Amino acid sequence: TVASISSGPKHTQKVPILTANETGATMPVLPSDSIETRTTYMHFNGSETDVECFLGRAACVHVTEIQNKDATGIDNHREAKLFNDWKINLSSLVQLRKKLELFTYVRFDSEYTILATASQPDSANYSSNLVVQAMYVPPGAPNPKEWDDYTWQSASNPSVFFKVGDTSRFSVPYVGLASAYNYFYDGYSHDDAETQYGITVLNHMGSMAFRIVNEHDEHKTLVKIRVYHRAKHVEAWIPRAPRALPYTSIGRTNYPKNTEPVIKKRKGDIKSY
Amino acid sequence: TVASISSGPKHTQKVPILTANETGATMPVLPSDSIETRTTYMHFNGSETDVECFLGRAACVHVTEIQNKDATGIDNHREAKLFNDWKINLSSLVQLRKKLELFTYVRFDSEYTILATASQPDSANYSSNLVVQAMYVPPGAPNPKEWDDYTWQSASNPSVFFKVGDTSRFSVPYVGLASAYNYFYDGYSHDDAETQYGITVLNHMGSMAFRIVNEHDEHKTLVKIRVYHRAKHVEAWIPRAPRALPYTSIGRTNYPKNTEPVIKKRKGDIKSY
Amino acid sequence: TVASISSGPKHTQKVPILTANETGATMPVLPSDSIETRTTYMHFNGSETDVECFLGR
Amino acid sequence: GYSDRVQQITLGNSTITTQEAANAVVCYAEWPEYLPDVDASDVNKTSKPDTSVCRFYTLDSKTWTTGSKGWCWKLPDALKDMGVFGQNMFFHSLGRSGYTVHVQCNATKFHSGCLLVVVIPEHQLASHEGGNVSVKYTFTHPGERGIDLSSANEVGGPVKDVLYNMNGTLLGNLLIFPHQFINLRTNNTATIVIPYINSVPIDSMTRHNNVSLMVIPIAPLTVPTGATPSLPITVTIAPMCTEFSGIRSKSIVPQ
Amino acid sequence: GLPTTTLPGSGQFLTTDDRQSPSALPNYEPTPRIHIPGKVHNLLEIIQVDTLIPMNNTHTKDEVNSYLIPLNANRQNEQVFGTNLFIGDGVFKTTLLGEIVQYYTHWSGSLRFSLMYTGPALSSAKLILAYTPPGARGPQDRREAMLGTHVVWDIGLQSTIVMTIPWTSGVQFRYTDPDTYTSAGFLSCWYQTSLILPPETTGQVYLLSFISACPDFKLRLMKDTQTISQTVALTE
Amino acid sequence: GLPTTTLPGSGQFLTTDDRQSPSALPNYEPTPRIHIPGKVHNLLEIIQVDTLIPMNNTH
Amino acid sequence: GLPTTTLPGSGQFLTTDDRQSPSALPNYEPTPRIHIPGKVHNLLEIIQVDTLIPMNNTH
Amino acid sequence: INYYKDAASTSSAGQSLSMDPSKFTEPVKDLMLKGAPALN
Amino acid sequence: INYYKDAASTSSAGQSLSMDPSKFTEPVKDLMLKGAPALN
Amino acid sequence: INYYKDAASTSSAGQSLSMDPSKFTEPVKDLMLKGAPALN
């Protein structure tokens, strides 16, 4: 492939460099339209800018935490972090979010990796070996109420059991209700006067509940869960302007008030170098 | 292959042993040009002197250390070794360095092995099990500021998570900007009167940041990281004189003052055996 | 596979929507027996409702 | 003698002529078309009023003055009240449509000024409150009036800051969306053909707008000496290939 | 039982590796795809669309005005604007090009810089745009500027001028984050003759300026952008 | 000895995965199947039989 | 699931072994090679060039 | 590839792709045609 | 070799090697030729 | 068998078995024959 062809002096009536940008086109002008060039080859394919590659590496999408401790006398397991749920999202930690929102609709399978590490902040004789249970709870399933409810039987709901310190990995097909996922949606769920705007139910990728299967030892053990997400089989439509201001909320476009100028001011003139 | 052919008495006008070294050549003289020889075969190929073999074994290129401890009240994580970076180099530990600098330009893929072991120098009930995170931070990426920054999300930057005591291994393609790497460069980055000499930006192999993912236990744990590097697919041009004096700095040729004579003095005469 | 065929106005002596449930049958009535439909395809096989799948986790 | 410059668009019972055009943009290089069966889901036969809905409606005019910040209309909202297009809209459960948008602004060879005319698929607005305040319905359904970016923040309304496109992105990058400029010195109209863009084959026309049309002054209007300091901008829009499905009782929407 | 040996790296999680995994939802059937205009396949497809450069960066809070380069009637010989070419920083940084370049470590290729004139139709002007390849200082006067890559632009019916910064380089890749060795030059613009307004007209006229990449362009070695960060996880 | 590398997920138990296992009862012979009317293959087969709706829910 | 047995040496790191590894930079394209005079392939090539011997070591 | 000798040890079965609701939805002795009168 | 039955479980896809910027860079209705005048 | 997609991930290269010291041992412009006089 040639990156530049050889081109010499020109004295024409045919001027490729004068255009009318009002038309909305970006005319494909090249170095050889306005200087004299020599042949050179590309030596490159643009492999690593493919959208599959761009969205295809694992990104941290969520960090939560649960603890193993005596539940005796706990009136609210959920509240003691005896167990914890997470409604899956890709817009809570901003790194991956800005990447996805370069597109309007996106379609992909997900590969999740879940790393779990334990901490024992206060005096323990040892490090126990805990098994985590991660249950995938689709909308309409009973939700866990205690850390050892009938729910955890999970007879119809996919669940994975792995050890703290290890990693769990599985992949979920594209679960969207429509043909793609809208990280933007300029609509409502119905024509209600007060219903929420923008956040919709066609960007729901399910939800996940974590708990330790082990009963309690004498000390307490903090287990912190990190969920990583990798898109595989990516398809993206309609590019948009990149995010400039900071994010404030999952699912709305809102930016913070009295934010700071995002364009760097010159130290000098327009004329400055 | 014959290592020596059979050759007998000679009384010629054709003298292969008289030459003129002023010409710059090393004339290919053999035993059979000046004594009577018998046939013998080589029985050998020179396999283990191939440059791929010479530069192809893992060498320790870096030892760093980070600790897991309560960051509560630490004003400078980087400074507490709560996390640590390393700008990749092959010229800080001298063993591999002398080997590479036998050549002027070198091109190869790298295979990294990272061994991490833990130490608990002061009273602990136990040994905790820590997961290390090694992030590859190319120039221009946000650099970690705390041990748990948004940076560690590493949504676009390759990172590996492995356990202390284990080893991590991955391989990076030749990331040089030019066609080869110059471990020598008799130039500057620009014609500045005070810019640095010799150290250039086309020997940059990236940079790497390490941290423990675990929160803190009651005791403190020292984790010491050793990075090993193995060249694979090696290509080397222009041999040079081997390094004689000791090294003083990454990237400059400078030797120490009042160094010692590097040639061993005879215990005796020129005539001595 | 078609999920619905195209069907237009009807003025018949042949009424598929009147039945006698006392018989014990569930007559296979479709949208196209009582409204005007357009063609659409199924795009689906019913894979995940197989009893092997239902009892297989 | 055809110029890129003169054009005629006849759609239904209405025709537009421009003698000073700058080509026309067809979003994503695709022209509006009806919904194919292979893509269909709802089993209902759809209704295609054709020429009674696919004609040109001219919205009420705006006034560009030196202080203007820009205006924003949403589709199909802007047309919610135009003739039979609008009736069909409130009466069917689902509908689908593409449009021809023609923005008009003429001046003289002594004026200067340049407007950006852009179509943004799925333009989800931001609340000026920050945090996770929502933007109430009424605020994102201004109707033919559209939203006036130089009007004041209101409560439950969107933010109207132009350097941020009403969503946290910079004005400068709106050029990645199908768009055309109106530069008084060149141009006097902008025309964009919009194919139907959605993640579902057909949708509700009232709970979801699928494009915002935005006209933004970028090089300020500068009139000749002692000229009146303003020009009107007119927007005429025509639904094209419209289909409605799931007819019934007639939606009732807030406010 | 087949004998195996495990190698160094066993059990590691590398966020960039690509392997198979069990599906959690065995036998599930995804929604059919329908057609949607606009599919993107390569980021290289989109960085060829031009977007506006806030060249007039001299303000103090972001404003529509930093997109406008002003022009003065009747000035002769003088300089319209200047900038270095660190596409990952400074004016370029918020543009779509700048914004994507920042996801990669290295770039190589030609850039296309165009200027669209917005002055009254009855005015006229001749400007010179100059590209100065690495190695010299930003030009200080047109004489200096005109000795490097340049285009005399004659303002006419055809409203825009497209200047190309042809790839001039020893090393075949440059860093996107500004680096010296790897630096790309300067871009300046001067009056060639001068802007002239018709009667009954007055004041400043402005140029809009765009940037996009030529088909020439290469970007490699993905990394994280300095353009976005956060201090606590967001919630709904 | 063939060189291997284990990936993330090793040792996990996913209730939905489908793999082979050793039989605890090697060589055992199950009872022959006889014919039984009524075999169900898909839940889609049965949701087409109609059943009564307690529409008058007001009690 | 295929039955395996691991041998002695599993998990060891031998600095001299030569195996495959995942690339951290999937799909990256290295700079083209250009021609450079002087390529060395074997150390045996270079030890045939003669160099001076500090024979007079007595200093 | 089965690694094991017994049939019980193989993975899950594969979709019936049988599907015939008529034993449940139309177990009538004399065949009913849709469109013809239910009771003649 | 896929070891798993479902398509979601396969590795990353392979390069589009599609690439056609014209839907984004030249969505004009009447074709513009480089070198010919923009507005006739 | 390569298990990985990228070339960097393959094992060590295999012996040049190239070997030609003459660029280093005899870079003279006019060819010298062993046995013939060095300087004529």
Burial I12-33 (b: 16+ CB within 10 A, else e): bbebbeebebebbbbbbbeebe
Containing D88, the helix (H) or strand (E) segment is helix D83-91
What are the tokens at D189? Answer: 């109209």
Chain D residue with CA closest to E208: the answer is D219
Containing C53, the helix (H) or strand (E) segment is helix C51-55
The stretches of E23-93 forming alpha helices (DSSP H) are: 43-46
Give A-chain residues touching I38 at CB under 8 angstroms: 18-20, 23
Cα torsion angle, A180, A183, A184, A190, sign: positive
Give which of A224, A39, A37, A19 is closest to A119, Cα–Cα.
A224
- Rounded to whole angstroms, the Cα distance separating D47 from D198 reads 19
Chains that touch H (3 or more CB pairs under 8 A): C, F, G
The shortest C-alpha distance from G27 to chain A (Å) reads 5
| Cβ atoms B172, B110 nearer than 8 A | yes
- Rounded to whole angstroms, the Cα distance separating E225 from E227 reads 5
Burial class (CB in 10 A: 0-12, 13-18, 19+), J38: middle
- What resolution, expressed in A, was reported for this entry? 3.0
The shortest C-alpha distance from E219 to chain G (Å) reads 9
What are the tokens at G19? Answer: 């195996």
Q: What is the DSSP code string of B18-64?
A: ---GGGS------GGGTS----EE-----GGGBHHHHH-S-EEEEEE
| Cβ atoms B186, B179 nearer than 8 A | no
> Could you count the other beta carbons within 10 Å of the beta carbon of residue B180?
22
β-sheet bridge partners, residue D236: D58, D102
Chain F residue with CA closest to G17: the answer is F3
Is the minimum CB–CB distance between F16 and chain H shorter than 8 Å? no
Please judge whether A263 and E159 are an interchain contact, meaning their C-beta atoms are less than 8 angstroms apart: no
**Site of tokens 């006392």:** C22
Please judge whether F42 and H16 are an interchain contact, meaning their C-beta atoms are less than 8 angstroms apart: yes
E-strand spans in E27-133? 39-40, 51-52, 68-71, 79-84, 104-108, 111-117, 126-132
Pick the CATH number of E1-236 from 2.60.120.20, 3.10.20.30, 3.40.640.10, 1.10.357.10: 2.60.120.20
Is the minimum CB–CB distance between G1 and chain H shorter than 8 Å? yes
Give which of D175, D167, D140, D166 is closest to D70, Cα–Cα.
D166
The shortest C-alpha distance from E228 to chain C (Å) reads 41
**Contact present, F and C (at least 3 Cβ pairs less than 8 Å):** yes
| Cβ atoms E74, E194 nearer than 8 A | yes
| Cβ atoms A239, D176 nearer than 8 A | yes
- Rounded to whole angstroms, the Cα distance separating A186 from B99 reads 62
- Rounded to whole angstroms, the Cα distance separating D174 from D32 reads 22
Residue A115 backbone phi and psi in degrees, to 5: -100, 135
The shortest C-alpha distance from E204 to chain I (Å) reads 26
Give D-chain residues touching E62 at CB under 8 angstroms: 163, 170
The shortest C-alpha distance from I39 to chain E (Å) reads 7
Please judge whether E49 and I21 are an interchain contact, meaning their C-beta atoms are less than 8 angstroms apart: yes
The range of the structural domain enclosing residue H31 comes to: 1-40
- Rounded to whole angstroms, the Cα distance separating A192 from D138 reads 10
- Structural domain spans, chain A: 1-273
Give A-chain residues touching G28 at CB under 8 angstroms: 47-48
The shortest C-alpha distance from E71 to chain B (Å) reads 34
Give H-chain residues touching F33 at CB under 8 angstroms: none
**Contact present, J and C (at least 3 Cβ pairs less than 8 Å):** no
Instruction: Calculate ∠ Cα E22-E28-E33, nearest 5°.
Output: 110
Please judge whether A261 and E103 are an interchain contact, meaning their C-beta atoms are less than 8 angstroms apart: no
The stretches of E24-131 forming alpha helices (DSSP H) are: 43-46, 96-101
**Contact present, A and H (at least 3 Cβ pairs less than 8 Å):** no
Is the minimum CB–CB distance between A92 and chain B shorter than 8 Å? no
Q: Is the peptide bond before E198 cis (omega within 30 degrees of 0)?
A: no
Give F-chain residues touching C26 at CB under 8 angstroms: 48-50
Chain A residue with CA closest to E68: the answer is A270
* C-alpha R_g of chain A: 26
Which of E12, E15, E18, E20 is the best residue to mutate to test the F interface, defined by the most F CB atoms within 10 Å of its own CB? E12
* Way the structure was solved: X-ray
| Cβ atoms D112, D231 nearer than 8 A | no
Give F-chain residues touching G1 at CB under 8 angstroms: 19-21
Give E-chain residues touching I16 at CB under 8 angstroms: 41-42
The CATH classification number of B1-273 equals 2.60.120.20
Q: Which of A158, A161, A167 sits opposite F8 (nearest CB)?
A: A167
Give which of B138, A184, H35 is closest to E226, Cα–Cα.
B138
Please judge whether B155 and A93 are an interchain contact, meaning their C-beta atoms are less than 8 angstroms apart: yes
Is the minimum CB–CB distance between A155 and chain C shorter than 8 Å? yes
Count CB pairs under 8 A between chains C and F. 20
Please judge whether D182 and A25 are an interchain contact, meaning their C-beta atoms are less than 8 angstroms apart: no
Please judge whether E22 and A33 are an interchain contact, meaning their C-beta atoms are less than 8 angstroms apart: no
Please judge whether J8 and B19 are an interchain contact, meaning their C-beta atoms are less than 8 angstroms apart: no
The shortest C-alpha distance from B162 to chain A (Å) reads 9
Which of F15, F42, F43, F44 is the best residue to mutate to test the H interface, defined by the most H CB atoms within 10 Å of its own CB? F42
What is the domain count for chain H? 1
> Could you count the other beta carbons within 10 Å of the beta carbon of residue A99?
25
Give A-chain residues touching C57 at CB under 8 angstroms: 155-156, 158
The shortest C-alpha distance from F7 to chain A (Å) reads 9
Cα torsion angle, E4, E8, E14, E18, sign: negative
Give which of B162, G25, B109, B214 is closest to E9, Cα–Cα.
B162
**Residue I19: which CATH number?**
4.10.80.10
Cα torsion angle, A43, A49, A53, A59, sign: positive
**Residue E79, C-beta contacts closer than 8 angstroms, at least 6 positions apart:** A271, E141, E142, E188, E189, E190
Is the minimum CB–CB distance between F8 and chain A shorter than 8 Å? yes
